Point group: C3
């Protein structure tokens, strides 16, 4: 049950009003996890630099209980990198994505955990 | 020595001016860790969706050097979920909480680490 | 290939317009990692408390594929704590820094991962 967030210096105004449903629909397919169990967080107007340049960049993170591995993460990257340059106009080379495989017992939800 | 943050789309104005002291007092008891060593971070006005809905939701995280386990996390969840709906009006089902057990050697503080 | 972010309640206006290049130049030396592969994220105006006080504080995080260990983290802390009080006027005792050693296979970049 994944969460994907984008932290970028790009301004709020360049944020396609589609992104949210967009990243939800895509990650759902990609990870093969329920669209209802996916939460997306977009953070623009941020103060950040990459390689010492304040040009458009992003540091993202995908947390998922499973669906995280070697070939998977590459697949996700190409996917998320394609979406990020197209929608936010963020070059692929100025983007990091931290992938995380959470343990069910460490994910609280609706009052309890997934354990 | 825990840190608990709330990232929500709810607007800054619905943030009880008590929450900070509130979550501090509670987590302190819950985890049985010094109130002085707890830091709370609240992030409202955020761009996020859950299950493809932009309705009130939250993705939280509790980082603590210990005090993290099976039954503990459930206990924390019910606690944090009760507080979050009551104070921020966020339904329990549209809330994720990532629990993390940090290693003392990996937590810098006041110039050094807890190792 | 590190990322260092600062989340503080200090106001945007107290953020030296140097910090970005500053933390980049320093971490680069410190961790001995390419300045081009370092991304810095600064988050001010935030709602946070520490020890139940809303006075200037910060919760930072340094993610790096390696260059993370026992004596390293202490060294980094003293470094980052010196920089944070001098530049942002944040006392060393009201600052936490979470250090993370990422696995290359879990870091997407420019379309693929570092694996």
């Amino acid at each position: 049950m994944p969460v994907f967030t984008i932290r970028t210096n790009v301004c709020r105004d360049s944020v396609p009003d589609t992104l949210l449903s967009d990243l939800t629909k895509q990650l759902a397919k990609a990870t093969g996890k329920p669209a209802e169990y996916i939460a997306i967080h977009i953070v623009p107007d941020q103060i950040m630099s990459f390689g010492d340049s304040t040009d458009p960049c992003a540091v993202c993170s995908l947390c998922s209980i499973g669906k995280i591995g070697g070939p998977q993460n590459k697949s996700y990257t190409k996917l998320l990198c394609d979406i990020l340059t197209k929608q936010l106009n963020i070059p692929a080379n100025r983007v990091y994505i931290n992938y995380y495989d959470l343990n069910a017992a460490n994910v609280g939800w609706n009052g309890s955990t997934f354990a």
